[PDB]
Nucleic acid binder design. Sequence first.
RNA 1: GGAGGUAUGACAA
RNA 2: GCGGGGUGGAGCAGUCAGGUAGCUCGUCGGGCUCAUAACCCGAAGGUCGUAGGUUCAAAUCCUGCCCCCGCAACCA
Lengths: 65, 153, 116, 117, 114
Amino acid sequence: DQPTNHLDPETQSIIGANFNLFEGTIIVVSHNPSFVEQIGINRMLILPSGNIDNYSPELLEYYSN
Amino acid sequence: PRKGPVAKRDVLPDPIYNSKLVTRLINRVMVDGKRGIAANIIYNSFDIIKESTGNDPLEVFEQAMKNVMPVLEVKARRVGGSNYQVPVEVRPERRTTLGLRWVVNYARLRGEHTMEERLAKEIMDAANNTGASVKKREDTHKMADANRAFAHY
Amino acid sequence: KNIESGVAHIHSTFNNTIVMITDTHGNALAWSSAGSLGFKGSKKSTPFAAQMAAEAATKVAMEHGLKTVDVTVKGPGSGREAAIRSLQATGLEVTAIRDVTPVPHXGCRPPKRRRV
Amino acid sequence: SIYEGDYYTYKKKYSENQLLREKMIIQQEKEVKELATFVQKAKQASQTNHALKRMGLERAIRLDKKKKNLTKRDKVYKRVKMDIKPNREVARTPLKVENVTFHYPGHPILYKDLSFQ
Amino acid sequence: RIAGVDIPRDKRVVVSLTYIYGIGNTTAKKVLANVGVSEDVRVRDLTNEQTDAIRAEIDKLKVEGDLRREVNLNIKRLMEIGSYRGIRHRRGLPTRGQNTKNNARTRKGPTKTV
RNA sequence: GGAGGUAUGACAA
RNA sequence: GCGGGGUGGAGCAGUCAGGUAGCUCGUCGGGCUCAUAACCCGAAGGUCGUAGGUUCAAAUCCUGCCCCCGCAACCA
Ligand SMILES: [K+]
Ligand SMILES: [K+]
Ligand SMILES: [Mg+2]
Ligand SMILES: [Mg+2]
Ligand SMILES: [Mg+2]
């Protein structure tokens, strides 16, 4: 739940890069656009309108709407 | 082959849905010529879709195909010392081939215990424009768009 | 700030295509190139990269306010036309097209042939 | 340290300063090594070579004064190292959520029949 | 639980008993038929009367540590008398005439490519 | 159609 | 006596500034080839010369000791 919060910018990039290589399932919440890009999200679940969707730059479309 | 294009053998329609596409789906799921098992999986899965959804399963399957069948494919071309992909339009026969291959292949990899459950879930997800089969179509279009510089080929 | 007439210089080589839009007096207003759109290597030389370069430079040029440009084409690159048409598509009015490929009337000795 | 400008300007000014500091420490080390190398050469020469032994002690004095004015390079702050690996293996269905509704007592329902896999 | 082994509580009795050393699929069916316990009941549902009947039934058979000592004594004997089979046991090679030029990995252990 | 110009591989057999 | 060195088969890092032993070539097994070389894929090979200390933990810091190499071991 917001892992990069409170972390210095250098440590954030380290966190994102290492998670990307993690060989397991990751349920993540993050308002930091850079961190999610490094992890390489696969599916995004939108709230409050439940929408299990494939991850893409359409994330921006949901943010706008 | 070198001589030229060959005859494509026709398939007869499904007995209960009166759809050739349903027969083609049955063939794709079939293993070792065991068509009885293949047909049972497809018909059970269309009954699951008739339960999770109130719509005609044949309608849901066709909507899944619309979201999965690709339009542009990448055709590897070897030019000199550089081998790069060339975007290519997919002929309608291959479109259903890829759609059936992708829907079946990713259903086999799903997590549900039984194939008909796995197939029904994969079909319904594709009908809603989500899931692995749709992601395979998105990547295929993504690859063509990137290599769109080689369209003149 | 605000222009009405200009000229678009399509510097298209074998390796890359640069599109530069100036006013009629040769003062630059906006420019793009295949290289600055992320294209690398052979991709920079393709007609599509030339097309994208023309678009990105055209839109910036029309943000300033610029209706009609004339085109000067230079170099042997394959992307000259894809740039010329891309200018028309994105909004500009291409009035004239000229070839300004430099030609020595002799001139200097060119570099050696690329083998031996 | 206080800079005028933005974050990038600070990084540019800082990176250059640490670069210029690093080069200073490099050249001070070379001169120390040079004296050290000659001091050793005199130290191992024959006791009969009076002048070289003399010069060796004279350079030993310069070597000492060098080593006492030699700026220490600040230890670069170490970055985090993470190696997260799972003990066991993931399944095709790690988590099953089916028709889950939840509301905090006295507030609107956040989601209704939430189901994902 | 039954013979000093916590048999799986969730499984059906016929299979749960198989987790006892010396009880196979056929032997489990025999003991349940003798005691009179249905084969389909999960052992979590076994009543103390049914469990004790199974324990009484199983106590008749040779299982677990008793069986393991019995078999090890047999192999021990083959080695002690110096029989061909005993040497096969002691040197980790197939004991029932199988060819060893290839395969024999179950007896030999992992391949030593050296 | 034709013509001048623009990596390694014994020896004998 | 003054220095420099001991880490996988060899040559080197890591040693100052303590946490996790690697890189280069080679070796072995399998590929590719008609075959060899080159190439591809896998594996092996050291608890850091050796023994005590310091520390939560040392290849690393400290100390000793044994080895190997360049100098020196006497000047009018
Ligand atoms: K044999
Ligand atoms: K074999
Ligand atoms: Mg040259
Ligand atoms: Mg058993
Ligand atoms: Mg035999």
